Ligand binder design. Sequence first.
Ligand SMILES: O=CCCCC[C@@H]1SC[C@@H]2NC(=O)N[C@@H]21
Ligand SMILES: O=CCCCC[C@@H]1SC[C@@H]2NC(=O)N[C@@H]21
Lengths: 941, 941
Amino acid sequence: YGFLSERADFAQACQDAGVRFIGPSPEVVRKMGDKVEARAIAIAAGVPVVPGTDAPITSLHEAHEFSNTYGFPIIFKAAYGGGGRGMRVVHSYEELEENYTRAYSEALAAFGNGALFVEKFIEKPRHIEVQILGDQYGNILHLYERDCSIQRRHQKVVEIAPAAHLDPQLRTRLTSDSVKLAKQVGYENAGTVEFLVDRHGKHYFIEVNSRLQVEHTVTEEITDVDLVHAQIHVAEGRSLPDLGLRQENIRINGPAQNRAQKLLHYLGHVMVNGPTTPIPVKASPSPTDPVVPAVPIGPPPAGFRDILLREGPEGFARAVRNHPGLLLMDTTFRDAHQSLLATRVRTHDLKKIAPYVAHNFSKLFSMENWGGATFDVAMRFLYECPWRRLQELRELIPNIPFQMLLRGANAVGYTNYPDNVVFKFCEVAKENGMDVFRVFDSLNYLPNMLLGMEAAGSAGGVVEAAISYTGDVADPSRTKYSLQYYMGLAEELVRAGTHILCIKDMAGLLKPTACTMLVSSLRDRFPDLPLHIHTHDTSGAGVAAMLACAQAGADVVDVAADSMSGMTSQPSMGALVACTRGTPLDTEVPMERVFDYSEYWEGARGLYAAFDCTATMKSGNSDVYENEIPGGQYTNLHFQAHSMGLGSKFKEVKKAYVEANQMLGDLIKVTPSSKIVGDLAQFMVQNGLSRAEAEAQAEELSFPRSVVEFLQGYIGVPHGGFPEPFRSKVLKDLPRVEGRPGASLPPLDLQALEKELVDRHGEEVTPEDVLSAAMYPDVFAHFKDFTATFGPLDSLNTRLFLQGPKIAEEFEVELERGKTLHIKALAVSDLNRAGQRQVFFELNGQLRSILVKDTQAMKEMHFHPKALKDVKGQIGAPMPGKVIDIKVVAGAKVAKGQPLCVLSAMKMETVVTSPMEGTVRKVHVTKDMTLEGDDLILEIE
Amino acid sequence: YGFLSERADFAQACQDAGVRFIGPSPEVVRKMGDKVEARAIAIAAGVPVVPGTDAPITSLHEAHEFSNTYGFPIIFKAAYGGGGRGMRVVHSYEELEENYTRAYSEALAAFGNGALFVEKFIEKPRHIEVQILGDQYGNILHLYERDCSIQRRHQKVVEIAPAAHLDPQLRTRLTSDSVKLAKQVGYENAGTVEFLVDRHGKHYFIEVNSRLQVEHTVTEEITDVDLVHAQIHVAEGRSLPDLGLRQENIRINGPAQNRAQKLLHYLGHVMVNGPTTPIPVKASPSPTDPVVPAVPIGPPPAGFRDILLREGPEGFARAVRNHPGLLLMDTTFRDAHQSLLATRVRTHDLKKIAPYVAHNFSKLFSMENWGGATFDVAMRFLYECPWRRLQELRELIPNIPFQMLLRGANAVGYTNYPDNVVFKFCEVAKENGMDVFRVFDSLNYLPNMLLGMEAAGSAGGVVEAAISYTGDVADPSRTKYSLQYYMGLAEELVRAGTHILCIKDMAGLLKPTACTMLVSSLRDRFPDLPLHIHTHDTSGAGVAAMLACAQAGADVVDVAADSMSGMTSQPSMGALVACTRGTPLDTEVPMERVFDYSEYWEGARGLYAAFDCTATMKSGNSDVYENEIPGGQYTNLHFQAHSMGLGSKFKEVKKAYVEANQMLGDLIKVTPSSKIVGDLAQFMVQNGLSRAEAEAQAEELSFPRSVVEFLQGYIGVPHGGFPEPFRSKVLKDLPRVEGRPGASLPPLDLQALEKELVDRHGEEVTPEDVLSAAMYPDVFAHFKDFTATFGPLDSLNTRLFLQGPKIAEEFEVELERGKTLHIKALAVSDLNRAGQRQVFFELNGQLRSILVKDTQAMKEMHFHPKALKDVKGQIGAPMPGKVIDIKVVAGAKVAKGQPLCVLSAMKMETVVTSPMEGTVRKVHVTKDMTLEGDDLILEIE
Ligand SMILES: O=CCCCC[C@@H]1SC[C@@H]2NC(=O)N[C@@H]21
Ligand SMILES: O=CCCCC[C@@H]1SC[C@@H]2NC(=O)N[C@@H]21
């Protein structure tokens, strides 16, 4: 083969040497090997041809005239070319010049002749070809047409004989026209007249293969005619009739999943580029995986979930109130790590210990495992589905109620949503096995809590209304958040139909005396209502606070596994179990089971050393009674301060946090209000501002977006109202939200969103995907693109996820039950000319290689811009950030306070505003430019 | 396969996992995989079985009772064993106990269970087996019996279907009994009931293979039933009738060359272990290949070889004498590099310039390209065939006579050979295209020269008798090698029928006055004889010496290409051509052609920088008139002195060379006599001996083997005889050779040697291989083993041969005309657990990997031994070397001068002898031990 039948000079050289060529005559090989001559012969034989130029085109102008006459699409083809090279389809006039030039250069390089011709492009043709056989006596026998339509880039891959579902009349036309064409040239060998068949059943001649084709074999199998025997005997001078070959005697006789490669691509990416998750501290994960304790064979014992499923939320609440002793709940699944390892704990590690929890802790009130930061963090930083985590944990723990932290009018998100999104989220959360909804508001703003309670109750969930605790009820000088404030809010939440009343001490402010006073007052007022107390051990007094709550008549307290307790986490489970043992408050939890649970979590916490709060805080700190910083905010505020170069000033940041809380009006501090106070505190320290200076200059200063959105009312109304005149000075003419922010939002069309997601990602979009996109559109889009590239990263152990494999390291990855990948990392190559490294693996005893991309290998940048602090017209970047939008151009008049650009840094759009009226002289920045602090954005005159 | 159908626990584990096992049920696999259970079922089905025990035998007594009942021969078989292991035939009672014990131990070791059973041994059975197929509906279709009787140690080798010449009634019994057996167990897959058929046509069941056998293919080819399709469809639950399978429808129908991998293995070896050729200096080969000058298209012009081929040796000699002008000859092909790069120039580089030489230097008298050191060095260090070099150069240069340096009674070797080897060497050299034989002796010993002249003349070669020049014929104080000595030897060589007379000045001692005197005296005596003068430019006077010879009536002078001339090489070709231009001695060689030739060789010499004499000698040196060290010996003696730690004492070595020459009797100094003087000079300097001390202590000292063999007479007799009493003192009672050393050697049987080589290396042994083995047995053996491992290394360029490729380096290797390898080196791995590195290549766009061996990666040793110089009984190693042989043991009495051990260092067996009479107290060395200088060999008391 090798397209040698195109050439005749070899056939002639055989004849001149006195050696027979077993094929057509040199004249027939020449006539049929020239596509222009062969086409002219086909027209003369009355065989239909594709509409096309009669000669090779010499100019782009002839291609333009052809395109005007026949319309697009058209195809350029090399006049002297075979095998699919030097061919270009053109769909439009804009493409014509580029594709002509490329087709010409490719034809010149491949065939030594750049001559092109133009044809009409037949869209979605069948490639049908007819086997012919001729003798030296002018007998021509055709053979049944084959189907060669299964092609990759115009190369044949699979060939079928006869053509499947071909119209018998079309078959007769194809075979008759092949025999006519062959007779017209005096053809004398096995050969193949090729056609394109359009969707309307018209056939068009394209080319004749004068060489026994690769696919002759399927014709032999359906005709019982040995083509190579026939070729030899014809070259001996035998006639087709003498071979028994007559036309009347010839009859017809009879998305791939790539999960393993995507995982190897992730592992190769981490080996070349480092961790894909941002690492805050230079600590390495443990090299040893945690030891999983032994679990009994069988279903776990019946728990409080069996009561909830049998008797509903009110039956569950009565069973909790009637329980003899103290009930505990496990927050290790979410709250404990959110505080200690910043919610980085992966579904992989949670699943390993889940069967042990189900068997040995079946008497837990609930396990807190989802809501708070876990929803965003799972998608954004762990690249895993939070819903799959819920479903898989629910299968492994069938007997313990699952609890989530729900914001009342915001669900698990950072902004307000239309009510129908919050309702649909609670419905789908309950369907996926969520049982208890701890409904809180960041300001205790009752209208937001009532919506979340109604949404959770309408879903059929246990409504736990949570009052966020701030201040000190035992301090008579703190009048704003008095005992009467808490009692009055509890009365409104009980009237709203809460099944359980929670006190949420998010910072660890509840002193044992305040515990006794608050919990006894609530118990005396509500004798039949279950009381749930949540605290943090930030002060090192959380165990004593929870014992005081239990003695004052709390039915439930929040605890964590001992190795996941203390500091900014919950009180120790083992400490509470040991201290209540043999009292009327005994939890009946065996201490040995708490130890085995803690040992697993000690090993697992070692995998997260890169995120551990102990890198920055070695113990609990009693300054929390002054600063009131929540556990998860303390860790985040420290990492942010270090990233901004304020790490040495963190004591000033804590002092500014107290001042910022007062300036803002001493509001409750929990996500997102704790972040708003944090951003203001960092802003004050960064700019060297005292409270009095920041309040005096409030009309001139560009406050953090979170502070502005709070003052606008986007998170609800704080107790006692907003601080005036401070709010009016910061907002100026900015729009204000009155009442509940979600109440003015139009309902989101979830069916329109589902359709958009199906169009973008394919038919596997679920209701969980729609709700994830509705709450977190950019995060969900990034998560889908990332998992489309790298596959199911939840299958990797946490060390391999964070650091990848070492060279010569061998490990196992379970994709599904009974599908293990044995993977060994072998080598990483040097950088190629495309800026890629080749990573080599063994996968199930076989060499694999993946091309990866090393940005670190080739990284450089330059920052021009500086703003003179003394020149009011020079606008510097107020933070390191990326330019999202530029609102002004050079020569534009700008008013004082007018938006100039939008920076996106630390996951917060900051609008940079004009400090003066003037004319923009020059803009120094571009869209997507990265700026450092004080980089010159623009000049104003 | 692997006898896995014996096991059912896998079939059960598939069923328990919900995965279909494509085979019989786990119960059928168990029943049929147990030979005792399967046999009991065969008896119950009425199928004949071999007479045998009903249970596994527990005692030798049960084997005795069985043997009494059934008679011998019997066979022990493992009860739980397959594949012919744990089986023993017993022919007699004397064999019963041994064979039982062996069969039991083999069964226990192979299968974990020693249980045996006894059967009657069927003598000379046919092994006939029947293919069965069953479905889940109880349909069983048998297929025709196969013949598996062609066995080696009970393993099947050749299988036939149907069984050849099988009785049709026996076939029907076999197939009926297989179908009965299969029905009795409810069999459900393709399977094989096996039988032994005796010489009387009785069949006996042995075993059923429940796994699609290796030999199923011959059954498919005779039945047109795809067994694997049938196995799959039966496992889908289809019936045999629904598959069209009914018994009535089933009928009977009737060394690879690895050159590219071996080259990649060499390149990988050099990348891991470094150069395979010993590198004397820390210089790197040039990264640039030499530019080959343009060659005319066509055959080269007629030269002096066309005269030689037309008119024979005497016609050639007359044409040389009658030539108007000075003829030149090119030593560059051999002598020039032997002196400068120590003969490391490869066939690869010689071939590249050969066509240019043929066209532009067609008037050369000859080109010297083979003999001297080139024969051994090509095989030993370049791993290339010297004969292939001769043949390929002869094809490329058809028109210039080829010249070799031939030792008269030793050919190109280092020892004397039987005469028939020297004659056969000259014959095969002439057949391979050698034209001129420069016959010399290292001592001008006429009887050795006459044999070499007769051998070369009898082959039909041009005999050039060469007188080796030493001394100064212009110095009347040097009486030993006077003008009369040279004239008298010339008369004897002319009387012996030399065609050409050569003066070989191997050191560059011929001063212009001595040239004039010697050459004019020879010309006056022999007016019609061609005179050829060879010198070296070691003194920097060689050009002036050759001009004086040409003026005195020399017809030919030796020259080298300018970049390969001077120093220890020949005089410059360009200098001689330029100095004779426009005189009666004009060479008619165009200077531009000499420049292009020199430029190629300048580039090529850069590839050999690692061997260049300029590492040690920056110019010619006139001290050669005092030391008389030949060019090639100077370079070698310096490298040896540096390897022995005497490099800083090389001036003392040159002085000791003069003293050693005198002590030995002032013999001519050329290979091997120049080495003998060199070894003595190094020995004197190493031991701090003056001439007078070495002559006084000659009975006590252990001289170098080369000096001893010289004094014995193994190289011939020196002019003036051996030095007495020095010879008698060194030799003592050692055997003396009188006369010509080859004359007492029995003829070598070359046909016996050819047969030995064919038995060792296969049928590709040539007459050239036989002669190479006859002259250099150990070198030739090593060369064949090396080229068997690494392939045709002559195809590699010289840089890649010496240093291998760099990582990411791409290069071409031409194996044959039109067969190019594109090779890229990609990576080298770390050391594996087997002490190997994996080297990765791209070969013709494809990844290749080779496992190589890094001795350097894992190299360590320890030397205990030291000999106190003051303790006469402590025998130290006289040189660094390897222990070849140990001649004595502890407790042996030894006489003074008795051989103690043989050391092999610097390619020279040195016998270590006792300095005293005594008893060997202790031997400290082992065979193959490597010793340093002064390492304690043994103690004598
Ligand atoms: O880096 C960006 C923020 C990542 C999430 C931080 C969570 S949101 C829930 C909790 N409350 C806070 O103020 N921060 C953490
Ligand atoms: O390394 C061992 C010796 C290698 C060959 C040396 C050659 S033999 C021809 C010539 N004459 C000498 O004395 N040495 C060189």
